[PDB]
Write a structure and sequence with these properties.
zymogen, Rossmann fold, about 270 residues, secreted, serine protease, seven-stranded parallel β-sheet, alpha/beta, 9 strands, EC 3.4.21.62
Length: about 270
């Protein structure tokens, strides 16, 4: 009765979960459209909302719930399986039900996450431009020991044009691209010098608002695979610093082609958590 989305074994999260490392006691903040906390396949420990009128534990869009499920859908006999099923899941609502949010709201969610001691922050969101406030927020979270992961964007490639969005473009954040079940680069996946790693992003099945499950495409789906992987590494090696977890993900990646299109390649968590 429990479906294992193709992305779990593609990044070898299953090999690691098999060793008994499932992200227990690692704190992951999902800065998104909120999370349908009542979903049977998700356990949200807490959060905050920086969007007017909406509580953090509701998701009127679907996006946040889907991202959360890829990171931590509960290991049981129903629904799907998350990359790090035992993680302490926090919903930080920074995007409205239309999937949009302000820099101010985003910066506050990052700050809240750093202040509240999150170990990993996932941002399946981005903008064409950045802001010093946002750069300062991510550089500080990173310097504080937090692993910061962001979706690279879905602008595809325009010749030699860099299409990586913010915050993924900042060097203190891991810019994640998207591949499909054949491990091929998804056409929509953004390109550019800052692209760091790749993760499953096309045809990703996960938890979806009102106790169901749905399939979505996007670097938004790729990102939570890396956030979850970071969680597995930390549960296995509590001692590592954020930069060490980051380097482990990128050094052990499966080469797929030119770094402008694939970064260091597809993540392999079995090899990264060795």
């Amino acid at each position: 009765a429990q479906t294992v989305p193709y992305g779990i074994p593609l990044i070898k999260a299953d090999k690691v979960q098999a060793q008994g490392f499932k992200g227990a006691n690692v704190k992951v903040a999902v800065l998104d459209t909120g999370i349908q906390a009542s979903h049977p396949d998700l356990n949200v420990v807490g959060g905050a909302s920086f969007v007017a009128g909406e509580a953090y534990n509701t998701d009127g869009n679907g996006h946040g719930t889907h991202v959360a499920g890829t990171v931590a859908a509960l290991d049981n006999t129903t629904g799907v399986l998350g990359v790090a099923p035992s993680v302490s899941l926090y919903a930080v609502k920074v995007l409205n039900s239309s999937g949009s949010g302000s820099y101010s709201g985003i910066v506050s969610g990052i700050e809240w996450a750093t202040t509240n001691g999150m170990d990993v922050i996932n941002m399946s969101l981005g903008g064409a431009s950045g802001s010093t406030a946002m750069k300062q927020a991510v550089d500080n979270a990173y310097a504080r020991g937090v692993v910061v992961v962001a979706a690279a964007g879905n602008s595809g490639n325009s010749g030699s044009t860099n299409t990586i969005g913010y915050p993924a473009k900042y060097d203190s954040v891991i810019a994640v691209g998207a591949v499909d079940s054949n491990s091929n680069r998804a056409s929509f996946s953004s390109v550019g010098a800052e692209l760091e790693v790749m993760a499953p992003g096309a045809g990703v099945y996960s938890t979806y608002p009102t106790n169901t499950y749905a399939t979505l495409n996007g670097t938004x789906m790729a990102s939570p695979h890396v956030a979850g992987a970071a969680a597995l590494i930390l549960s296995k090696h509590p001692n590592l610093s954020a930069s060490q977890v980051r380097n482990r993900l990128s050094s052990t990646a499966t080469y797929l082609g030119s770094s402008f299109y694939y970064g260091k390649g597809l993540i392999n968590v079995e090899a990264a958590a060795q």
